[PDB]
Design an enzyme around this catalytic site. Sequence first.
Site, mmCIF file in Angstrom:
data_model
loop_
_atom_site.group_PDB
_atom_site.id
_atom_site.type_symbol
_atom_site.label_atom_id
_atom_site.label_comp_id
_atom_site.label_asym_id
_atom_site.label_seq_id
_atom_site.Cartn_x
_atom_site.Cartn_y
_atom_site.Cartn_z
ATOM 1 N N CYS A 1 -2.150 0.267 -9.984
ATOM 2 C CA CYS A 1 -2.733 1.278 -10.851
ATOM 3 C C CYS A 1 -3.410 2.395 -10.068
ATOM 4 O O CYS A 1 -4.147 2.143 -9.112
ATOM 5 C CB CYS A 1 -3.743 0.637 -11.795
ATOM 6 N N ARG B 1 0.833 -1.193 0.000
ATOM 7 C CA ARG B 1 0.000 0.000 0.000
ATOM 8 C C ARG B 1 0.869 1.245 0.000
ATOM 9 O O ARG B 1 2.026 1.202 0.399
ATOM 10 C CB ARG B 1 -0.901 0.005 1.231
ATOM 11 N N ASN C 1 -16.896 -3.357 -3.291
ATOM 12 C CA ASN C 1 -15.554 -3.459 -3.849
ATOM 13 C C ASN C 1 -15.271 -4.949 -4.073
ATOM 14 O O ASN C 1 -15.014 -5.384 -5.195
ATOM 15 C CB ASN C 1 -14.577 -2.835 -2.839
HETATM 16 ZN ZN LIG Z 1 -5.942 0.181 -13.927
#
Ligand SMILES: [Zn+2]
Lengths: 162, 162
Positions: A104, A60, A118
């Site tokens: 990303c 993270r 999610n």
């Molecule tokens: Zn992506």
Amino acid sequence: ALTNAQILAVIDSWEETVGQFPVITHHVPLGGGLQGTLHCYEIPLAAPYGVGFAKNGPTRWQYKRTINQVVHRWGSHTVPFLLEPDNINGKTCTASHLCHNTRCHNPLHLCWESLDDNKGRNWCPGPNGGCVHAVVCLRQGPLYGPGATVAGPQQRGSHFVV
Amino acid sequence: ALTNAQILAVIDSWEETVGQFPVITHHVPLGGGLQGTLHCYEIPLAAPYGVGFAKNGPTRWQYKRTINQVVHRWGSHTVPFLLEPDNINGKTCTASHLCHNTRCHNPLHLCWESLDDNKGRNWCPGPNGGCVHAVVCLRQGPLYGPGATVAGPQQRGSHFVV
Ligand SMILES: [Zn+2]
Ligand SMILES: [Zn+2]
Ligand SMILES: [Zn+2]
Ligand SMILES: [Zn+2]
């Protein structure tokens, strides 16, 4: 603490930096057998990550900016939504990856919703396979399919009915 | 390592006892706008739970049997699958509730599968809504639906492409 205008400046500098992240072009399933292309903008694996970015644990990162001497930190994927409510149905909103690629940070690949919502996109058939998510999925979930169940419902006697 | 016979005896006694569990009739979404009827066999909320059953923490119970002077314990929902592998290549098999009702021990409402397969059913459209699970769902998952996404993908400038 921060005004809406100050926040906007934060989001804009965040977009500019993330815009320089290397791009990975890949093909993904959209559902129903249809193939599509996505362009993920991935944060580097090692420093330099880009101004304001830093690792925050195993896999993270967080975005940090000091404004008027006060230090502000945000989860790296959350910045695009700093002006949005941070909870819904009493649940904390999370930065959800429509591309399912953790590295990303492309805002065109992220949405703001509860962890449950999610998690579910993972088993979603996709935009071309039946997706009913109001904020449409970008691709078919990586875990979508028949499963690998080893044993189904069964009984040896006759004590039960479904 | 119990013999095949001893295991059959455990399942048979388990079935008979669970068969005496109060039966609750639930009407549930099947997907496709249709509703169905399920008969769950629920373990009591407090002692007495039934011969061989005991609480093993919150929302969890154990089934015990004394075989060859030794007490054996199994997760209350795992007994129907004592003759099946307990893992596929390390992937731990779990007692998955097709009815999504923890207290229920109806074997016709349980399947043996990995945590991921188990979790995914939470969002399945159901047997009449497009379920593709090899071992078909009995109902539409509790979390299936449009979701409650606060904000979708979006960019301010033109730094990105999907
Ligand atoms: Zn992506
Ligand atoms: Zn979807
Ligand atoms: Zn049930
Ligand atoms: Zn299903």
